C-alpha cells in the first residue's frame, strides 16, 4: 500500500538509493512514478542538468496544485551513485518513468536528444506513457 508514506511533499522526492529502491524498484506498486536522474552538485557545472531541473519543477509543481497514482523525484548522481551504476548511466540528465507492474519499456525513457526538456514537452510524454495529463502552467 505504501502510498500514505508516499506523502512526503516537497514535490519533488529527492531520492538516496535506498528510497529509490523501496519506493521505485520494490513491490507492491500501483502508482506510477516519474524520476528525474541529474548531477546539479557544483563542482559537477552540468549546466543542461541545471536547466532540466528547473523545467522539472515547473512541471512537477503543476501537477502538485492541480491533483494517487503519480508522484516525482529525483536521483542526483551524488546522492544515487549506486543507482546510475544499477542503471549503467555515464551521463546526466535523464527522465524516466517507472510503471506499476514490470520494468520500463524502450518509450520509459522520455527522448531528451530528440524534444528538448520544455516542461510542455515532458508532460507530453508523461501523458503517452500514463494517460495523465497535466495541463503545466507558467511555460
Same mark, same amino acid.
Given at each position: 500500500?505504501?502510498?500514505?508514506? &508516499? *506523502?512526503? !511533499?516537497?514535490?519533488?522526492?529527492?531520492? /538516496?538509493?535506498?528510497? $529509490? !529502491?523501496? $519506493?521505485?524498484?520494490?513491490?507492491?506498486?500501483? +502508482? =506510477?512514478?516519474? #524520476?528525474? @536522474?541529474?548531477?546539479?552538485?557544483?563542482?559537477?557545472?552540468? *549546466?543542461?542538468?541545471?536547466?532540466?531541473?528547473?523545467? +522539472?519543477?515547473?512541471?512537477?509543481? =503543476? &501537477?502538485? +496544485?492541480? *491533483?494517487?497514482?503519480?508522484?516525482? =523525484?529525483? #536521483?542526483? +548522481?551524488?546522492?544515487?551513485?549506486?543507482?546510475?551504476?544499477?542503471?549503467?548511466? /555515464?551521463?546526466?540528465?535523464?527522465?524516466?518513468?517507472?510503471?506499476?507492474?514490470? !520494468?520500463?519499456?524502450?518509450?520509459?525513457? @522520455?527522448?531528451?536528444? !530528440?524534444?528538448? $526538456?520544455?516542461?510542455?514537452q515532458l508532460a507530453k510524454w508523461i501523458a503517452d506513457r500514463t494517460d495523465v495529463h497535466i495541463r503545466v502552467f507558467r511555460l
Open positions: 500500500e505504501q502510498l500514505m508514506e &508516499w *506523502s512526503s !511533499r516537497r514535490s519533488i522526492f529527492r531520492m /538516496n538509493g535506498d528510497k $529509490f !529502491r523501496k $519506493f521505485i524498484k520494490a513491490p507492491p506498486r500501483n +502508482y =506510477s512514478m516519474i #524520476v528525474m @536522474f541529474t548531477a546539479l552538485q557544483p563542482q559537477r557545472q552540468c *549546466s543542461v542538468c541545471r536547466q532540466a531541473n528547473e523545467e +522539472y519543477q515547473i512541471l512537477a509543481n =503543476s &501537477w502538485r +496544485y492541480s *491533483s494517487n497514482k503519480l508522484f516525482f =523525484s529525483m #536521483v542526483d +548522481y551524488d546522492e544515487g551513485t549506486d543507482v546510475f551504476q544499477q542503471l549503467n548511466m /555515464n551521463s546526466a540528465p535523464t527522465f524516466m518513468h517507472f510503471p506499476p507492474k514490470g !520494468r520500463p519499456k524502450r518509450a520509459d525513457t @522520455f527522448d531528451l536528444q !530528440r524534444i528538448g $526538456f520544455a516542461a510542455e
